[PDB]
Design a protein around this ligand. Structure first.
Ligand SMILES: O=C(Nc1ccc(Cl)c(COc2cccnc2)c1)C1=CC(F)C[C@@H](N2CCOCC2)C1
Length: 351
């Protein structure tokens, strides 16, 4: 009933995997887990196999593992990463210490593509169309990516795009400091802790990515947070009273009122020679007030995507029960939760 498992030490971590996974080759590790490329002999797919580093070490660890499983079990979209397989070598709940996730192997991101390929406006259209299509799906289930960047967008040779999160790491304070790609794509409200954030933080990141595809250059390469806010605000303008009032942090509100007031720039003179439709969409994405930002759903109807848009083939997600996000549980409760879900996984119909 249970497939047979086999052992292999790679980089002094033990991998126990069903025999159907062959030719395991390490691709990356990080505090939260290690990844291998593999060949699934049962489907003829090349796969990535993520083994979670100490999945139930803390409460906050055990919850995180439960969170990633649920997410990845829910996501079934062309432009979003799907789960091909999840497994444990544990034979019971008492043995359960280890969690392995299987997806389609990605190889080449948008950061590979913007660095090493001349992109036409049609290429930018197709790329941004697919992110927006994926985000419409992610957002309709109330899931927020929070970390959209070119290194989290997976792109094949026909320019076809999947949203994932490659992040194997902790997301600390220093990793966000300095001249770092980990902070260039973030919405200003979440970068600076301005207010309680929402879905539209993802849209900010899309406008950041999109700019970069049009110019082949980072839109906001801040040497630090404050220097990144000065960049942002130079492009889009210092806020007025209406937005100032919405920033819950009085301390941070006091800082943006220190700044010499600036008008929103002429985007057609920042983005010299762009499709005026690309320009227009950028101005409706890169809006400081997240209440005023265009949504994915509204963006898929923008004239800039007329060649791709089909309102009959841009689906929403199924209802996602996220009520667990507001419960306190013990490790063994998260672990058992995770376990039901492992033991319950039913494969994609081999498409
Ligand atoms: O992609 C995820 N996890 C994941 C889960 C399993 C694996 Cl194997 C991977 C890595 O895939 C690779 C690795 C190396 C080379 N090619 C492909 C990643 C995500 C985890 C999340 F918790 C969230 C998530 N994301 C949420 C927002 O919408 C998009 C999906 C994606």
């Amino acid at each position: 009933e249970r497939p047979t498992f086999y052992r292999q030490e790679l980089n002094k971590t033990i991998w126990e995997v069903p025999e159907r996974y062959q030719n395991l080759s390490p691709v990356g590790s990080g505090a939260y887990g290690s990844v291998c490329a593999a060949f699934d002999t049962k489907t003829g797919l090349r796969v990535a196999v993520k083994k979670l580093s100490r999945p139930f070490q803390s409460i906050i660890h055990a919850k995180r593992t439960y969170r990633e499983l649920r997410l990845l079990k829910h996501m079934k979209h062309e432009n979003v990463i799907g789960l091909l397989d999840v497994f444990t070598p544990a034979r019971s709940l008492e043995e359960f210490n280890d969690v392995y996730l299987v997806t389609h192997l990605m190889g080449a991101d948008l950061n590979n593509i913007v660095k090493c390929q001349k992109l036409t406006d049609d290429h930018v259209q197709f790329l941004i169309y697919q992110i927006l299509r994926g985000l419409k799906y992610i957002h309709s289930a109330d899931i927020i990516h929070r970390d959209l960047k070119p290194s989290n967008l997976a792109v094949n040779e026909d320019c076809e795009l999947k949203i994932l999160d490659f992040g194997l790491a902790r997301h600390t304070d220093d990793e966000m400091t300095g001249y770092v790609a980990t902070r260039w794509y973030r919405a200003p409200e979440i970068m600076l802790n301005w207010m309680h954030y929402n879905q539209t933080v993802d849209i900010w990141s899309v406008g950041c990515i999109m700019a970069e595809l049009l110019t082949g250059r980072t839109l906001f390469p801040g040497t630090d947070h404050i220097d990144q806010l000065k960049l942002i605000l130079r492009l889009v303008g210092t806020p007025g009273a209406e937005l100032l009032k919405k920033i819950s942090s009085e301390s941070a509100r006091n800082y943006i009122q220190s700044l010499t007031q600036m008008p929103k720039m002429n985007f057609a003179n920042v983005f010299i020679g762009a499709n005026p439709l690309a320009v227009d969409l950028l101005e409706k994405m890169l809006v400081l007030d997240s209440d005023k930002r265009i949504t994915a759903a509204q963006a898929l109807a923008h004239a800039y995507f007329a060649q791709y848009h089909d309102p009959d083939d841009e689906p929403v997600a199924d209802p996602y029960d996220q009520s667990f996000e507001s419960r306190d549980l013990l490790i063994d409760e998260w672990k058992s939760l995770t376990y039901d879900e492992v033991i319950s996984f039913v494969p994609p119909p081999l498409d």
